[PDB]
Amino acid sequence: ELFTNNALNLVIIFGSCAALILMSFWFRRGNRKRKGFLFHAVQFLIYTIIISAVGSIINYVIENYKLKFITPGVIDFICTSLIAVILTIKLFLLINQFEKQQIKKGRDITSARIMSRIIKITIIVVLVLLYGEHFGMSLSGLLTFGGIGGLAVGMAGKDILSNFFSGIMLYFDRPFSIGDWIRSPDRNIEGTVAEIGWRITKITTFDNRPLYVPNSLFSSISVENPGRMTN
Amino acid sequence: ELFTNNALNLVIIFGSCAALILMSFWFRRGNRKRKGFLFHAVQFLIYTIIISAVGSIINYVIENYKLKFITPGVIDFICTSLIAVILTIKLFLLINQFEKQQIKKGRDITSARIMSRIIKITIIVVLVLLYGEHFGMSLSGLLTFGGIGGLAVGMAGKDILSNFFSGIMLYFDRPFSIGDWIRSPDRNIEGTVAEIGWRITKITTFDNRPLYVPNSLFSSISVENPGRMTN
């Protein structure tokens, strides 16, 4: 209200004014006016700071002034819920722009819609699992639900992650190189190496055909390199 | 009661009136009068808000006025139980309409009833596991029960989830395309690619027969692409 109320409020509204000035500057985005990824992250961060400052202000108001019946528990529940809502809106907008980019690149409409919906459901589940205390339920129930889900996801996704880990290993310690003829007594991977990727290795066979070998195979089989022979 | 009681109640009945007005508007459902999925979700949410407001009102009444013998612990137990009951009713109605849609599409009636029952039992188990604190019991017992169930479910459902994860991988990084003749030295998948799905890939063999390859195979075998040969 007056100067006395501001003194009783310490310096909180000053933080809100500073955040408003920062948002006005970020409208020009400092060095270059644009948006994307980090812009939404910093906007969400400053919104969280503003909401926390407003919560502190209303808590001080209800403490020093008349208590009335506000029960600040629901006030922190409401501020957390608003933060969750704005985070969900930001994530939905981000995945919508991702779907727009995918459809611009040229892809099946139904497939892109289904993929967007998969990302939607995954985001909702993760946010429910993480935020499930300000409005959530049983600690045991959430722990069990998340444990079952995580066990299933970890068991099911082992092979793709294994391929990518072997790709990292190949990036750091690779027994062959591009253009080397390679072989294996365990599997049929014969040909000359054409490309080394993060998930698969592309090899040109001796009948001029591309062969795509998963990277994890190089972590469990013996690899011979006739391209480096001496005689 | 009178204006003094309303002042002692702060603003809670106003929230109930606002929720009633929102329900009246949702009867016309805003832009288009209809029902389904999100309609039941928002109805359940507003019912939960109304029940929480009523609980706050009765708590304030028993605090400021005569205490009598109400023991607000059973009052919060009752409100949580009512929320659970309305949630169960909504879910049962939703799966009943799902069964109606399935039977309309044309399917064995016994299989539809069995599937509906399965969904009923699964939803009952999940709700008991999640809400098992307001009328629930031992945290150790619930943790153990849910852990055993989740471990069994996660180990049992590994292959289907692996197929769908490999389908997502194929959607993002695919070594072949529609119409490509493909091969493998590890398994018999020879033919031309006709369809790429989320669970299986449909391939036309060279005797004009459809072959359905589970997607997870593409994450562990070497795939040759004679359709991209140069000579």
mmCIF file of N, CA, C and O in Angstrom, chain B residues 147-229:
data_model
loop_
_atom_site.group_PDB
_atom_site.id
_atom_site.type_symbol
_atom_site.label_atom_id
_atom_site.label_comp_id
_atom_site.label_asym_id
_atom_site.label_seq_id
_atom_site.Cartn_x
_atom_site.Cartn_y
_atom_site.Cartn_z
ATOM 1 N N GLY B 147 5.458 -54.203 -5.689
ATOM 2 C CA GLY B 147 6.745 -54.529 -6.277
ATOM 3 C C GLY B 147 6.740 -55.883 -6.956
ATOM 4 O O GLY B 147 7.266 -56.032 -8.060
ATOM 5 N N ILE B 148 6.134 -56.884 -6.314
ATOM 6 C CA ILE B 148 6.020 -58.202 -6.935
ATOM 7 C C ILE B 148 5.203 -58.111 -8.218
ATOM 8 O O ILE B 148 5.597 -58.636 -9.270
ATOM 9 N N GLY B 149 4.055 -57.429 -8.151
ATOM 10 C CA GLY B 149 3.223 -57.295 -9.336
ATOM 11 C C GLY B 149 3.931 -56.580 -10.472
ATOM 12 O O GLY B 149 3.890 -57.024 -11.620
ATOM 13 N N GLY B 150 4.604 -55.471 -10.160
ATOM 14 C CA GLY B 150 5.300 -54.719 -11.186
ATOM 15 C C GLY B 150 6.480 -55.468 -11.769
ATOM 16 O O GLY B 150 6.746 -55.376 -12.966
ATOM 17 N N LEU B 151 7.207 -56.214 -10.934
ATOM 18 C CA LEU B 151 8.310 -57.020 -11.441
ATOM 19 C C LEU B 151 7.804 -58.079 -12.412
ATOM 20 O O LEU B 151 8.366 -58.255 -13.504
ATOM 21 N N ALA B 152 6.724 -58.773 -12.045
ATOM 22 C CA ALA B 152 6.164 -59.783 -12.935
ATOM 23 C C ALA B 152 5.678 -59.161 -14.238
ATOM 24 O O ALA B 152 5.945 -59.681 -15.328
ATOM 25 N N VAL B 153 4.974 -58.030 -14.145
ATOM 26 C CA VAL B 153 4.428 -57.392 -15.336
ATOM 27 C C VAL B 153 5.547 -56.879 -16.236
ATOM 28 O O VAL B 153 5.481 -57.002 -17.464
ATOM 29 N N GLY B 154 6.594 -56.302 -15.643
ATOM 30 C CA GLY B 154 7.696 -55.792 -16.436
ATOM 31 C C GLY B 154 8.473 -56.884 -17.144
ATOM 32 O O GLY B 154 8.864 -56.722 -18.301
ATOM 33 N N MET B 155 8.719 -58.006 -16.462
ATOM 34 C CA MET B 155 9.415 -59.097 -17.134
ATOM 35 C C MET B 155 8.536 -59.758 -18.190
ATOM 36 O O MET B 155 9.038 -60.217 -19.222
ATOM 37 N N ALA B 156 7.223 -59.820 -17.953
ATOM 38 C CA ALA B 156 6.338 -60.492 -18.896
ATOM 39 C C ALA B 156 6.078 -59.669 -20.152
ATOM 40 O O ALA B 156 5.894 -60.241 -21.232
ATOM 41 N N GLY B 157 6.058 -58.344 -20.043
ATOM 42 C CA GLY B 157 5.703 -57.498 -21.166
ATOM 43 C C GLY B 157 6.883 -56.928 -21.924
ATOM 44 O O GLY B 157 6.747 -55.929 -22.634
ATOM 45 N N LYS B 158 8.049 -57.558 -21.782
ATOM 46 C CA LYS B 158 9.272 -57.003 -22.355
ATOM 47 C C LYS B 158 9.254 -57.029 -23.881
ATOM 48 O O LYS B 158 9.707 -56.078 -24.524
ATOM 49 N N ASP B 159 8.732 -58.104 -24.479
ATOM 50 C CA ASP B 159 8.862 -58.279 -25.925
ATOM 51 C C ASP B 159 7.974 -57.311 -26.703
ATOM 52 O O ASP B 159 8.410 -56.735 -27.708
ATOM 53 N N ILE B 160 6.727 -57.129 -26.268
ATOM 54 C CA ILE B 160 5.829 -56.201 -26.954
ATOM 55 C C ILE B 160 6.383 -54.781 -26.891
ATOM 56 O O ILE B 160 6.418 -54.058 -27.900
ATOM 57 N N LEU B 161 6.829 -54.365 -25.707
ATOM 58 C CA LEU B 161 7.395 -53.033 -25.557
ATOM 59 C C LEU B 161 8.676 -52.877 -26.365
ATOM 60 O O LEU B 161 8.936 -51.797 -26.903
ATOM 61 N N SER B 162 9.482 -53.938 -26.462
ATOM 62 C CA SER B 162 10.673 -53.888 -27.303
ATOM 63 C C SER B 162 10.301 -53.684 -28.767
ATOM 64 O O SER B 162 10.952 -52.911 -29.479
ATOM 65 N N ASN B 163 9.257 -54.373 -29.227
ATOM 66 C CA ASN B 163 8.805 -54.193 -30.604
ATOM 67 C C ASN B 163 8.364 -52.757 -30.854
ATOM 68 O O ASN B 163 8.702 -52.167 -31.887
ATOM 69 N N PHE B 164 7.626 -52.169 -29.912
ATOM 70 C CA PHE B 164 7.175 -50.793 -30.111
ATOM 71 C C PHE B 164 8.325 -49.789 -30.036
ATOM 72 O O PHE B 164 8.339 -48.802 -30.786
ATOM 73 N N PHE B 165 9.302 -50.021 -29.156
ATOM 74 C CA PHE B 165 10.464 -49.141 -29.096
ATOM 75 C C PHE B 165 11.270 -49.207 -30.389
ATOM 76 O O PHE B 165 11.729 -48.176 -30.900
ATOM 77 N N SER B 166 11.448 -50.411 -30.934
ATOM 78 C CA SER B 166 12.116 -50.532 -32.226
ATOM 79 C C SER B 166 11.294 -49.904 -33.341
ATOM 80 O O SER B 166 11.865 -49.407 -34.315
ATOM 81 N N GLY B 167 9.967 -49.913 -33.223
ATOM 82 C CA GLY B 167 9.149 -49.193 -34.187
ATOM 83 C C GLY B 167 9.391 -47.696 -34.151
ATOM 84 O O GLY B 167 9.479 -47.046 -35.194
ATOM 85 N N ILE B 168 9.513 -47.136 -32.948
ATOM 86 C CA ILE B 168 9.852 -45.717 -32.821
ATOM 87 C C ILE B 168 11.225 -45.440 -33.426
ATOM 88 O O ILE B 168 11.421 -44.456 -34.161
ATOM 89 N N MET B 169 12.196 -46.309 -33.134
ATOM 90 C CA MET B 169 13.534 -46.158 -33.701
ATOM 91 C C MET B 169 13.491 -46.182 -35.224
ATOM 92 O O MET B 169 14.135 -45.362 -35.888
ATOM 93 N N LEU B 170 12.737 -47.123 -35.798
ATOM 94 C CA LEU B 170 12.601 -47.193 -37.248
ATOM 95 C C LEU B 170 11.934 -45.943 -37.796
ATOM 96 O O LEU B 170 12.270 -45.479 -38.891
ATOM 97 N N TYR B 171 10.977 -45.385 -37.052
ATOM 98 C CA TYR B 171 10.362 -44.134 -37.471
ATOM 99 C C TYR B 171 11.393 -43.017 -37.552
ATOM 100 O O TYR B 171 11.348 -42.188 -38.468
ATOM 101 N N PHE B 172 12.329 -42.971 -36.607
ATOM 102 C CA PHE B 172 13.298 -41.880 -36.645
ATOM 103 C C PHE B 172 14.521 -42.178 -37.510
ATOM 104 O O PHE B 172 14.984 -41.295 -38.237
ATOM 105 N N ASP B 173 15.060 -43.394 -37.453
ATOM 106 C CA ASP B 173 16.280 -43.736 -38.190
ATOM 107 C C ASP B 173 16.014 -45.091 -38.838
ATOM 108 O O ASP B 173 16.089 -46.129 -38.174
ATOM 109 N N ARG B 174 15.698 -45.077 -40.130
ATOM 110 C CA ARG B 174 15.328 -46.284 -40.858
ATOM 111 C C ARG B 174 16.338 -46.558 -41.964
ATOM 112 O O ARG B 174 16.588 -45.671 -42.799
ATOM 113 N N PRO B 175 16.935 -47.751 -42.023
ATOM 114 C CA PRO B 175 17.922 -48.020 -43.078
ATOM 115 C C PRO B 175 17.308 -48.310 -44.438
ATOM 116 O O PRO B 175 18.042 -48.326 -45.432
ATOM 117 N N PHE B 176 16.001 -48.538 -44.521
ATOM 118 C CA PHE B 176 15.344 -48.876 -45.774
ATOM 119 C C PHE B 176 14.116 -47.991 -45.955
ATOM 120 O O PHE B 176 13.811 -47.136 -45.121
ATOM 121 N N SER B 177 13.408 -48.198 -47.063
ATOM 122 C CA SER B 177 12.199 -47.448 -47.366
ATOM 123 C C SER B 177 11.205 -48.377 -48.051
ATOM 124 O O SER B 177 11.496 -49.546 -48.318
ATOM 125 N N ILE B 178 10.015 -47.848 -48.336
ATOM 126 C CA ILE B 178 8.976 -48.633 -48.989
ATOM 127 C C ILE B 178 9.409 -48.965 -50.408
ATOM 128 O O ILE B 178 9.820 -48.084 -51.173
ATOM 129 N N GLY B 179 9.314 -50.242 -50.769
ATOM 130 C CA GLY B 179 9.713 -50.702 -52.079
ATOM 131 C C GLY B 179 11.123 -51.235 -52.171
ATOM 132 O O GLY B 179 11.526 -51.685 -53.249
ATOM 133 N N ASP B 180 11.886 -51.200 -51.082
ATOM 134 C CA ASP B 180 13.261 -51.678 -51.085
ATOM 135 C C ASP B 180 13.302 -53.183 -50.855
ATOM 136 O O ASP B 180 12.646 -53.699 -49.947
ATOM 137 N N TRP B 181 14.072 -53.874 -51.687
ATOM 138 C CA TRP B 181 14.382 -55.281 -51.470
ATOM 139 C C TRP B 181 15.455 -55.374 -50.393
ATOM 140 O O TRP B 181 16.518 -54.757 -50.518
ATOM 141 N N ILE B 182 15.180 -56.127 -49.328
ATOM 142 C CA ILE B 182 16.090 -56.231 -48.197
ATOM 143 C C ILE B 182 16.348 -57.697 -47.884
ATOM 144 O O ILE B 182 15.619 -58.591 -48.316
ATOM 145 N N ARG B 183 17.406 -57.929 -47.113
ATOM 146 C CA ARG B 183 17.893 -59.270 -46.830
ATOM 147 C C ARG B 183 18.592 -59.262 -45.480
ATOM 148 O O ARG B 183 18.839 -58.208 -44.890
ATOM 149 N N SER B 184 18.921 -60.456 -44.998
ATOM 150 C CA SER B 184 19.676 -60.590 -43.760
ATOM 151 C C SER B 184 20.409 -61.924 -43.733
ATOM 152 O O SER B 184 19.812 -62.969 -44.015
ATOM 153 N N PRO B 185 21.706 -61.931 -43.406
ATOM 154 C CA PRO B 185 22.419 -63.204 -43.244
ATOM 155 C C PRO B 185 22.096 -63.939 -41.952
ATOM 156 O O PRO B 185 22.498 -65.100 -41.810
ATOM 157 N N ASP B 186 21.387 -63.311 -41.016
ATOM 158 C CA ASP B 186 21.065 -63.925 -39.733
ATOM 159 C C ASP B 186 19.684 -64.568 -39.705
ATOM 160 O O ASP B 186 19.530 -65.662 -39.158
ATOM 161 N N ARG B 187 18.677 -63.914 -40.278
ATOM 162 C CA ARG B 187 17.318 -64.432 -40.310
ATOM 163 C C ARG B 187 16.777 -64.347 -41.730
ATOM 164 O O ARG B 187 17.346 -63.676 -42.594
ATOM 165 N N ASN B 188 15.665 -65.039 -41.964
ATOM 166 C CA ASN B 188 14.997 -65.026 -43.263
ATOM 167 C C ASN B 188 13.951 -63.918 -43.253
ATOM 168 O O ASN B 188 12.853 -64.087 -42.713
ATOM 169 N N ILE B 189 14.293 -62.773 -43.843
ATOM 170 C CA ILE B 189 13.367 -61.653 -43.964
ATOM 171 C C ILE B 189 13.346 -61.161 -45.406
ATOM 172 O O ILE B 189 12.957 -60.019 -45.675
ATOM 173 N N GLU B 190 13.758 -62.018 -46.338
ATOM 174 C CA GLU B 190 13.933 -61.599 -47.724
ATOM 175 C C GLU B 190 12.610 -61.188 -48.359
ATOM 176 O O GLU B 190 11.576 -61.827 -48.152
ATOM 177 N N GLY B 191 12.655 -60.126 -49.147
ATOM 178 C CA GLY B 191 11.486 -59.617 -49.829
ATOM 179 C C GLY B 191 11.599 -58.117 -50.010
ATOM 180 O O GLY B 191 12.646 -57.526 -49.774
ATOM 181 N N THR B 192 10.493 -57.513 -50.431
ATOM 182 C CA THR B 192 10.411 -56.072 -50.625
ATOM 183 C C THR B 192 9.528 -55.454 -49.549
ATOM 184 O O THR B 192 8.451 -55.976 -49.243
ATOM 185 N N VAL B 193 9.984 -54.337 -48.985
ATOM 186 C CA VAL B 193 9.256 -53.694 -47.898
ATOM 187 C C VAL B 193 7.957 -53.110 -48.431
ATOM 188 O O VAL B 193 7.955 -52.315 -49.379
ATOM 189 N N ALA B 194 6.841 -53.505 -47.820
ATOM 190 C CA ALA B 194 5.527 -53.009 -48.195
ATOM 191 C C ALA B 194 4.929 -52.047 -47.187
ATOM 192 O O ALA B 194 4.194 -51.141 -47.579
ATOM 193 N N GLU B 195 5.225 -52.216 -45.900
ATOM 194 C CA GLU B 195 4.656 -51.344 -44.883
ATOM 195 C C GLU B 195 5.560 -51.343 -43.661
ATOM 196 O O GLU B 195 6.099 -52.383 -43.287
ATOM 197 N N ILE B 196 5.713 -50.178 -43.042
ATOM 198 C CA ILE B 196 6.465 -50.042 -41.800
ATOM 199 C C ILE B 196 5.494 -49.566 -40.731
ATOM 200 O O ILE B 196 4.980 -48.443 -40.799
ATOM 201 N N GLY B 197 5.241 -50.417 -39.738
ATOM 202 C CA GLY B 197 4.335 -50.110 -38.660
ATOM 203 C C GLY B 197 5.048 -49.878 -37.341
ATOM 204 O O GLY B 197 6.277 -49.887 -37.247
ATOM 205 N N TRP B 198 4.240 -49.665 -36.303
ATOM 206 C CA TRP B 198 4.767 -49.436 -34.966
ATOM 207 C C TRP B 198 5.157 -50.725 -34.257
ATOM 208 O O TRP B 198 6.021 -50.690 -33.375
ATOM 209 N N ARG B 199 4.553 -51.850 -34.619
ATOM 210 C CA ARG B 199 4.868 -53.137 -34.009
ATOM 211 C C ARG B 199 5.562 -54.101 -34.956
ATOM 212 O O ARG B 199 6.511 -54.773 -34.552
ATOM 213 N N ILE B 200 5.118 -54.189 -36.210
ATOM 214 C CA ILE B 200 5.693 -55.114 -37.174
ATOM 215 C C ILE B 200 5.905 -54.399 -38.500
ATOM 216 O O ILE B 200 5.326 -53.346 -38.772
ATOM 217 N N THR B 201 6.758 -54.993 -39.325
ATOM 218 C CA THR B 201 7.011 -54.546 -40.687
ATOM 219 C C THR B 201 6.474 -55.594 -41.651
ATOM 220 O O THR B 201 6.749 -56.787 -41.491
ATOM 221 N N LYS B 202 5.700 -55.150 -42.636
ATOM 222 C CA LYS B 202 5.105 -56.038 -43.622
ATOM 223 C C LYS B 202 5.946 -56.033 -44.891
ATOM 224 O O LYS B 202 6.182 -54.974 -45.483
ATOM 225 N N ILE B 203 6.372 -57.222 -45.311
ATOM 226 C CA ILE B 203 7.299 -57.410 -46.417
ATOM 227 C C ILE B 203 6.674 -58.383 -47.407
ATOM 228 O O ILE B 203 6.111 -59.405 -47.007
ATOM 229 N N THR B 204 6.762 -58.065 -48.695
ATOM 230 C CA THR B 204 6.247 -58.946 -49.739
ATOM 231 C C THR B 204 7.373 -59.863 -50.201
ATOM 232 O O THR B 204 8.366 -59.400 -50.769
ATOM 233 N N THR B 205 7.218 -61.162 -49.964
ATOM 234 C CA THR B 205 8.224 -62.127 -50.381
ATOM 235 C C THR B 205 8.204 -62.277 -51.901
ATOM 236 O O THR B 205 7.355 -61.721 -52.602
ATOM 237 N N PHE B 206 9.155 -63.046 -52.422
ATOM 238 C CA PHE B 206 9.292 -63.193 -53.863
ATOM 239 C C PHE B 206 8.361 -64.247 -54.448
ATOM 240 O O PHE B 206 8.348 -64.424 -55.670
ATOM 241 N N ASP B 207 7.587 -64.945 -53.619
ATOM 242 C CA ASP B 207 6.481 -65.763 -54.092
ATOM 243 C C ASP B 207 5.135 -65.095 -53.842
ATOM 244 O O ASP B 207 4.102 -65.775 -53.827
ATOM 245 N N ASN B 208 5.137 -63.776 -53.628
ATOM 246 C CA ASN B 208 3.924 -62.967 -53.505
ATOM 247 C C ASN B 208 3.117 -63.336 -52.260
ATOM 248 O O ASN B 208 1.899 -63.508 -52.308
ATOM 249 N N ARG B 209 3.813 -63.443 -51.128
ATOM 250 C CA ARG B 209 3.162 -63.698 -49.858
ATOM 251 C C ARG B 209 3.539 -62.626 -48.843
ATOM 252 O O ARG B 209 4.689 -62.171 -48.823
ATOM 253 N N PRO B 210 2.603 -62.199 -47.996
ATOM 254 C CA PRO B 210 2.941 -61.228 -46.944
ATOM 255 C C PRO B 210 3.687 -61.902 -45.800
ATOM 256 O O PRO B 210 3.355 -63.017 -45.394
ATOM 257 N N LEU B 211 4.699 -61.213 -45.280
ATOM 258 C CA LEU B 211 5.495 -61.680 -44.156
ATOM 259 C C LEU B 211 5.566 -60.562 -43.127
ATOM 260 O O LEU B 211 5.849 -59.413 -43.476
ATOM 261 N N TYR B 212 5.296 -60.894 -41.871
ATOM 262 C CA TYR B 212 5.199 -59.908 -40.800
ATOM 263 C C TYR B 212 6.382 -60.093 -39.861
ATOM 264 O O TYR B 212 6.418 -61.049 -39.080
ATOM 265 N N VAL B 213 7.341 -59.179 -39.933
ATOM 266 C CA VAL B 213 8.581 -59.261 -39.170
ATOM 267 C C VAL B 213 8.439 -58.373 -37.936
ATOM 268 O O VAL B 213 8.155 -57.178 -38.085
ATOM 269 N N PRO B 214 8.612 -58.903 -36.727
ATOM 270 C CA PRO B 214 8.619 -58.035 -35.544
ATOM 271 C C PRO B 214 9.741 -57.010 -35.629
ATOM 272 O O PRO B 214 10.840 -57.304 -36.098
ATOM 273 N N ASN B 215 9.449 -55.794 -35.167
ATOM 274 C CA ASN B 215 10.372 -54.679 -35.350
ATOM 275 C C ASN B 215 11.667 -54.846 -34.570
ATOM 276 O O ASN B 215 12.719 -54.402 -35.044
ATOM 277 N N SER B 216 11.622 -55.477 -33.395
ATOM 278 C CA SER B 216 12.818 -55.616 -32.572
ATOM 279 C C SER B 216 13.940 -56.354 -33.287
ATOM 280 O O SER B 216 15.114 -56.117 -32.978
ATOM 281 N N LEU B 217 13.611 -57.222 -34.249
ATOM 282 C CA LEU B 217 14.645 -57.908 -35.018
ATOM 283 C C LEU B 217 15.576 -56.928 -35.716
ATOM 284 O O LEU B 217 16.770 -57.207 -35.853
ATOM 285 N N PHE B 218 15.059 -55.778 -36.148
ATOM 286 C CA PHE B 218 15.902 -54.812 -36.839
ATOM 287 C C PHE B 218 16.885 -54.119 -35.909
ATOM 288 O O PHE B 218 17.760 -53.393 -36.391
ATOM 289 N N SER B 219 16.768 -54.319 -34.601
ATOM 290 C CA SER B 219 17.699 -53.735 -33.649
ATOM 291 C C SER B 219 18.838 -54.674 -33.271
ATOM 292 O O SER B 219 19.722 -54.270 -32.510
ATOM 293 N N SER B 220 18.849 -55.907 -33.782
ATOM 294 C CA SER B 220 19.862 -56.873 -33.379
ATOM 295 C C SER B 220 20.453 -57.689 -34.520
ATOM 296 O O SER B 220 21.349 -58.497 -34.263
ATOM 297 N N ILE B 221 19.994 -57.518 -35.758
ATOM 298 C CA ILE B 221 20.516 -58.282 -36.882
ATOM 299 C C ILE B 221 21.063 -57.319 -37.926
ATOM 300 O O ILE B 221 20.704 -56.140 -37.973
ATOM 301 N N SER B 222 21.949 -57.840 -38.769
ATOM 302 C CA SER B 222 22.487 -57.070 -39.882
ATOM 303 C C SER B 222 21.517 -57.120 -41.053
ATOM 304 O O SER B 222 21.066 -58.196 -41.451
ATOM 305 N N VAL B 223 21.201 -55.953 -41.605
ATOM 306 C CA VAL B 223 20.231 -55.825 -42.684
ATOM 307 C C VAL B 223 20.975 -55.424 -43.950
ATOM 308 O O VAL B 223 21.668 -54.401 -43.974
ATOM 309 N N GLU B 224 20.832 -56.229 -44.994
ATOM 310 C CA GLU B 224 21.370 -55.919 -46.309
ATOM 311 C C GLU B 224 20.267 -55.343 -47.186
ATOM 312 O O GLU B 224 19.096 -55.706 -47.060
ATOM 313 N N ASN B 225 20.651 -54.432 -48.078
ATOM 314 C CA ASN B 225 19.710 -53.712 -48.936
ATOM 315 C C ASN B 225 20.131 -53.886 -50.390
ATOM 316 O O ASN B 225 20.756 -52.990 -50.976
ATOM 317 N N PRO B 226 19.815 -55.029 -51.002
ATOM 318 C CA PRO B 226 20.078 -55.181 -52.441
ATOM 319 C C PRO B 226 19.303 -54.201 -53.298
ATOM 320 O O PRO B 226 19.720 -53.929 -54.428
ATOM 321 N N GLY B 227 18.196 -53.651 -52.800
ATOM 322 C CA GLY B 227 17.474 -52.634 -53.539
ATOM 323 C C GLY B 227 18.255 -51.363 -53.777
ATOM 324 O O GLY B 227 17.840 -50.548 -54.608
ATOM 325 N N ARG B 228 19.370 -51.173 -53.072
ATOM 326 C CA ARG B 228 20.235 -50.015 -53.256
ATOM 327 C C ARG B 228 21.590 -50.399 -53.837
ATOM 328 O O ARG B 228 22.563 -49.659 -53.663
ATOM 329 N N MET B 229 21.682 -51.536 -54.522
ATOM 330 C CA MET B 229 22.954 -51.941 -55.100
ATOM 331 C C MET B 229 23.356 -50.991 -56.224
ATOM 332 O O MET B 229 22.530 -50.285 -56.807
#
